[PDB]
Design a protein around this ligand. Structure first.
Ligand code: 092
Ligand code: ZN
Length: 394
């Protein structure tokens, strides 16, 4: 799959994007690769953060669906007009698909100044598409219209006046064995909406957090390429930070640091990595009572940021943060690993990435199996609203 290697780029903390074309003749746009959502949406009008945008009127193959769409996130929001057009991924499979496209006509706190992307490719499932689940997602249309296998894989890699450039690979339709070492371990997709998974155990430097495992997945756990941080439920975040602070206590950081609101620095090349612990997330295995662990380094959860001031220092941001909407395994987790979104088999694979950042004493790892007798249920059941209950599903 050599032509798809190195098909992702971006700026550290601002998203990985892939080049796509939309329309006839093809307009090129940089599109955020987001496994935490299910819409293909592109800037379609002027915005102070956009260099360029989709112009429906210049496309001979555009069809208007004469329907609007609205997507608020917590942080972030956009709206636009629905239609279809021809879409291709130049550094992807050699095919062209007719897909749904949301033409973003207005937004708030969505586009990111300097990120160099103009749209989003939601790679998750129809259930969480807007306005509803009859708007077929891009990947679904790709699979139905072409012979491309129902799987994609992501290798996200490497992280004074500008942020650092990052690179990665999105392999559509298969697995490229040059992008990983060792074994590939699979965790079930719990339900096809988000890429929901189940964490059964958490350790910080070998030490079990010893919480009821349902807390790890309160109110869900998901794999999301479009989120920078590892985000943890409030209770878990608190326990995690208490344990990391204890490991690192030779260094008394400001509160702002642990809130992700302040950098901490050392003289170039002198960062004391070994005072920061590894974090191990045990994921449910394909077999009853089995699990496997993925282990990340401080090199993953301390994000490097270059101080225009003291550019003579190596400075870092803490990239683990509190959530009220469940665990998010964001780019912090994914930069450790080659991650296989095996939709055909309702599972997510992890292996050690051939490009992850480490040192001479520790590595990110994927290891198993681990076995538990009479393993309880670690999944949470989100309270059912009357609104959601009333939906029909024909
Ligand atoms: C629940 O939707 C998700 O998790 C998606 C969408 C996402 C990150 N991943 C988000 O939340 N805001 C936002 C803003 C810009 C780009 C991507 C996103
Ligand atoms: Zn009905």
């Amino acid at each position: 799959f050599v032509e798809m290697v190195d098909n992702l780029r971006g700026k550290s903390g601002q998203g990985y994007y892939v080049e796509m074309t939309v329309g006839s003749p093809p307009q090129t746009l940089n599109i955020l690769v987001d496994t935490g959502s299910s819409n293909f949406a592109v800037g379609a009008a002027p915005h102070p953060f956009l260099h360029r945008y989709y112009q429906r009127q210049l496309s001979s193959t555009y069809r208007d669906l004469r329907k609007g769409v609205y997507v608020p996130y917590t942080q972030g929001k956009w709206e636009g007009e629905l239609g279809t057009d021809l879409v291709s991924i130049p550094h992807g499979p050699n095919v062209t698909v007719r897909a749904n496209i949301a033409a973003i006509t207005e937004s708030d706190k969505f586009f990111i100044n300097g990120s160099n992307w103009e749209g989003i490719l939601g790679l998750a499932y129809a259930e969480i598409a807007r306005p509803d689940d009859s708007l077929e997602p891009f990947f679904d249309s790709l699979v139905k219209q072409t012979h491309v296998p129902n799987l994609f894989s992501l290798q996200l890699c490497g992280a004074s006046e500008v942020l650092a450039s990052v690179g990665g690979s999105m392999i559509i339709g298969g697995i490229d064995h040059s992008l990983y070492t060792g074994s590939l371990w699979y965790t079930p997709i719990r339900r096809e909406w988000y890429y929901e998974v189940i964490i059964v155990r958490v350790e910080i430097n070998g030490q079990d957090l010893k919480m009821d495992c349902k807390e790890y997945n309160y109110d869900k756990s998901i794999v999301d390429s479009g989120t920078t941080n590892l985000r943890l439920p409030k209770k878990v975040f608190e326990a995690a930070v208490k344990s990391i602070k204890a490991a690192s206590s030779t260094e008394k950081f400001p509160d702002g640091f642990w809130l992700g609101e302040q950098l901490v620095c050392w003289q170039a090349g002198t960062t004391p990595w070994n005072i920061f612990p590894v974090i191990s997330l045990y994921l449910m295995g394909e077999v009853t009572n089995q699990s496997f662990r993925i282990t990340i380094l401080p090199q993953q959860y301390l994000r490097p940021v270059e101080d225009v001031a003291t550019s003579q220092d190596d400075c870092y941001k803490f990239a683990i943060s509190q959530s009220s909407t469940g665990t998010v395994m964001g780019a912090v987790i994914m930069e450790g690993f080659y991650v296989v979104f095996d939709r055909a088999r309702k599972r997510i694979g992890f292996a050690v990435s051939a490009c992850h950042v480490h040192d001479e004493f520790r590595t990110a790892a994927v290891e198993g199996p681990f076995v538990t007798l009479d393993m309880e249920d670690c999944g949470y059941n989100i309270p059912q609203t009357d609104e959601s209950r009333s939906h029909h599903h024909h």
